[PDB]
Amino acid sequence: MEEGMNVLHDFGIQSTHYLQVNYQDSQDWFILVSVIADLRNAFYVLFPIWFHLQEAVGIKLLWVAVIGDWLNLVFKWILFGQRPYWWVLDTDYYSNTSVPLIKQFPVTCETGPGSPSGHAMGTAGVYYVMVTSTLSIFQGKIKPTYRFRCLNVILWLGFWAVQLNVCLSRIYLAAAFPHQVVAGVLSGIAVAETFSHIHSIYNASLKKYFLITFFLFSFAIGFYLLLKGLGVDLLWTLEKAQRWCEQPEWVHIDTTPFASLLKNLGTLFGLGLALNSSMYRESCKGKLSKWLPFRLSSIVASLVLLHVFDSLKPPSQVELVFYVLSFCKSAVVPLASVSVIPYCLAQVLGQP
Numbered sequence: 001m002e003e004g005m006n007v008l009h010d011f012g013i014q015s016t017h018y019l020q021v022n023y024q025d026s027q028d029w030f031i032l033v034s035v036i037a038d039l040r041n042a043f044y045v046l047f048p049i050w051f052h053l054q055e056a057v058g059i060k061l062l063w064v065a066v067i068g069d070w071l072n073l074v075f076k077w078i079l080f081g082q083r084p085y086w087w088v089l090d091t092d093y094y095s096n097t098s099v100p101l102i103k104q105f106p107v108t109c110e111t112g113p114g115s116p117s118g119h120a121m122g123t124a125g126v127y128y129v130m131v132t133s134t135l136s137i138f139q140g141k142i143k144p145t146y147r148f149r150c151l152n153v154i155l156w157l158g159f160w161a162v163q164l165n166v167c168l169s170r171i172y173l174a175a176a177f178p179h180q181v182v183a184g185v186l187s188g189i190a191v192a193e194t195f196s197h198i199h200s201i202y203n204a205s206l207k208k209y210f211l212i213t214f215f216l217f218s219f220a221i222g223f224y225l226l227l228k229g230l231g232v233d234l235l236w237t238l239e240k241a242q243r244w245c246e247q248p249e250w251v252h253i254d255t256t257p258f259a260s261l262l263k264n265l266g267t268l269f270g271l272g273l274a275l276n277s278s279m280y281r282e283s284c285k286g287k288l289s290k291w292l293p294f295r296l297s298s299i300v301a302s303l304v305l306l307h308v309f310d311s312l313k314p315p316s317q318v319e320l321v322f323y324v325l326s327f328c329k330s331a332v333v334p335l336a337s338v339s340v341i342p343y344c345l346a347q348v349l350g351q352p
């Protein structure tokens with residue numbers, strides 16, 4: 001079976017080399033694409049706008065993002081994926097021949113397993129959710145049967161253009177293989193379609209949120225400990241993304257599996273706290289609820305303040321402190337977006 005993996009890996013290496021040699025002028029564009037395709041944006045800028053435009057779409061988007069990322073982490077641990085930027089320097093394949101010369105970039109060195117691709121899955125799920133929601137909302141046009149079809153065609157072309165751009169960006173930076181991005185896209189599509197039939201998430205008590213979060217934490221930690229007690233470790237990539245990196249400062253703690261898990265669980269718990277609170281009821285379910293200026297002000301403030309607040313970086317000297325502070329920091333963005341800032345605007349606008 002290893003021959004097939006070698007064949008796909010060699011095809012990915014050749015694709016990366018061709019893209020890097022024949023299109024040397026597009027490195028800035030692909031770096032920008034990879035930066036934009038981050039889930040940080042999905043949690044910081046995409047969620048507030050959709051939540052303050054239509055609550056159900058925002059809740060669905062956040063749930064899809066968090067659950068898809070958790071499933072991605074679990075399947076990354078299960079599948080034992082690889083990356084080109086250390087495989088090309090570690091493999092025995094290019095022994096009787098010449099090693100292809102692929103170049104590494106500051107946003108290339110990643111400390112997690114390869115398949116499935118996280119960027120492709122995370123972007124596919126969120127953008128499918130947004131496109132489907134928009135198409136569902138706009139079934140009210142003046143002249144139908146050609147204008148609605150025009151909008152449908154335009155949106156479904158844009159979605160696939162975005163997906164192709166993200167796949168090419170991940171391949172160019174020598175961070176993923178061509179099959180991993182396709183698998184990630186299909187998995188994100190499947191997850192976004194599966195959450196279209198689950199309805200016991202829009203009105204859930206804090207007890208259910210707490211139990212779901214604790215189960216998600218405990219399953220991952222128990223999986224890690226159970227495997228660690230049987231002779232296999234799921235953190236083997238931290239020693240491969242360290243020697244095979246051109247510069248030492250390019251390897252960051254922010255991309256480790258524990259950091260991602262803690263951030264996801266913090267976001268979910270923060271949403272659970274924000275939804276079941278007195279401030280949320282007093283602000284988002286009052287007289288200034290559907291008023292357009294209030295919602296626009298909420299979007300603007302929750303964008304500006306969140307952008308400024310993202311500049312507070314927890315210390316990385318001690319790993320446990322970093323993890324707990326990452327959880328606490330990720331638990332705040334739902335809170336500030338949903339409960340606090342709308343409350344402040346409610347006591348500002350309607351209290352003269």
Ligand SMILES: O=P(O)(O)OC[C@H]1O[C@@H](O)[C@H](O)[C@@H](O)[C@@H]1O
Pocket residue numbers: 039069072110112113114116117118119120122170175176254255256260
């Ligand atoms: O492996 P990919 O597809 O290049 O993306 C990996 C990224 O996927 C994201 O889901 C994780 O939060 C990041 O920590 C990780 O770096």
